[PDB]
Write a protein that binds this ligand. Structure first.
Ligand SMILES: [K+]
Ligand SMILES: [K+]
Lengths: 64, 115, 64
DNA sequence: CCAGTCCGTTAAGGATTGCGCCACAT
DNA sequence: GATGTGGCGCAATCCTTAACGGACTG
């Protein structure tokens, strides 16, 4: 069966590799996406923090 | 032509191989003490090497000014722009790039640079 | 030649493959970290919003 | 001719990459 | 047991680069 073991394995090795070659590409892409996402988020947290601190100061400005 | 074909070619004692730290060292010492000229003379201090070889070795590899850094994008822009005008005037173009020898550009262009 | 050609190539090959294995290890890392903070910011955004919302109800529902 | 320069061209050999054999983790 | 991965060597090929061999200048 050795012959068979080989033939089958060589097919497996190629599939395994095409898979990994894709995974690596997909991964390199996630790095872009995330970095971009992370950027807009860090922006949103700033924004909200301003709106929040403002609204608070607003309350703290109303008389009893 | 006859004498030049023999004196500068057939002579079996003409080392035309790689340069050893020592060989490069003797040239750097000399060129540093007597200047980057008189290559025919300087060569005499190097078994097997003729002046031309020493000169080319100094200008392309040993001269301290020669930058061995990766090609920046700025340099590339200059090269491409200049080549559109001048063509394969490597020597000419070389004057536009701080520490790059005409040979460096010629190489860079003929490989890396050609898309 | 042949004998040395091979020895020399094998070095180049091991080298080239290593370099790649490392770049793919970094990218795999750069993603994790980017996924970590990204998750963190997402939470921070959730918090701030809730607060903003709550604070605003309280404000609109004030006496008059 | 001489001493310097220039430039096209190409051997030399390092960097990649597809293929298949293997060990062995899953 | 059968299948999926990570290594590795081979070879053919991609890529760069050093520097040789004409040719030109003054
Ligand atoms: K000599
Ligand atoms: K220069």
């Amino acid at each position: 069966e050795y012959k068979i073991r080989r033939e089958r394995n060589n097919i497996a090795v190629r599939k395994s590799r095409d898979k990994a070659k894709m995974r690596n590409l997909e991964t390199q892409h996630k790095v872009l996406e995330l970095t971009a996402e992370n950027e807009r988020l860090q922006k949103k947290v700033e924004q909200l923090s301003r709106e929040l601190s403002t609204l608070r100061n607003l309350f703290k400005q109303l008389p009893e | 032509q006859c004498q030049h074909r023999w004196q500068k070619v057939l002579n079996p004692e003409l080392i035309k191989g790689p340069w050893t730290k020592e060989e490069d060292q003797r040239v750097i010492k000399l060129v540093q003490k007597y200047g980057p000229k008189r290559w025919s003379v300087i060569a005499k201090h190097l078994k097997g090497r003729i002046g031309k070889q020493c000169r080319e070795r100094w200008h392309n590899h040993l001269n301290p000014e020669v930058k061995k850094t990766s090609w920046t994008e700025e340099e590339d822009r200059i090269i491409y722009q200049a080549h559109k005008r001048l063509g394969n005037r490597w020597a000419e173009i070389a004057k536009l790039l701080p520490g790059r020898t005409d040979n460096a550009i010629k190489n860079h262009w003929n490989s890396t640079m050609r898309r």
